[PDB]
Design a protein around this ligand. Structure first.
Ligand SMILES: [Cl-]
Ligand SMILES: [Cl-]
Ligand SMILES: [Cl-]
Ligand SMILES: [Cl-]
Ligand code: NA
Length: 129
């Protein structure tokens, strides 16, 4: 599924991301825009051993199981396929695990390099959630 900006913002709000661990909603919408272009089936297979899955491009090295890499971990305790669903709930649950693990939204490269420090509130402009 390819989401629109406000459509995804609504779903993320429903799943409780607005202000989660200090990150107002626009942070999460901006991260998804640059990570996946809002596409739930985005998948990128990297030379560094990461396969990144779904709307938040979550990494198989640590967070989900796809079977391919026996030295990896599965800390969200999910198949990576769960991150490719049309509903965002597994992606949001695993994102929440990543951030609350003594960490932040620095876990998304595109957040650090495209969203941090910007007017992230504007990703919810015209959404009237
Ligand atoms: Cl957009
Ligand atoms: Cl907090
Ligand atoms: Cl990671
Ligand atoms: Cl694996
Ligand atoms: Na894994």
């Amino acid at each position: 599924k390819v989401f629109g900006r406000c459509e995804l913002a609504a779903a993320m709000k429903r799943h409780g991301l607005d202000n989660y661990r200090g990150y107002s909603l626009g942070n999460w919408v901006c991260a998804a825009k640059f990570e996946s272009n809002f596409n739930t089936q985005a998948t990128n297979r990297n030379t560094d051993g990461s396969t990144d899955y779904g709307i938040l491009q979550i990494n198989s090295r640590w967070w989900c199981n796809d079977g391919r890499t026996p030295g990896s971990r599965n800390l969200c305790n999910i198949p990576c396929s769960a991150l490719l669903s049309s509903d965002i709930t597994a992606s949001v649950n695993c994102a929440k695990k990543i951030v609350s693990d003594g960490n932040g939204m620095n876990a998304w490269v595109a957040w650090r390099n495209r969203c941090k420090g910007t007017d992230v509130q504007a990703w919810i402009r015209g959404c009237r959630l």
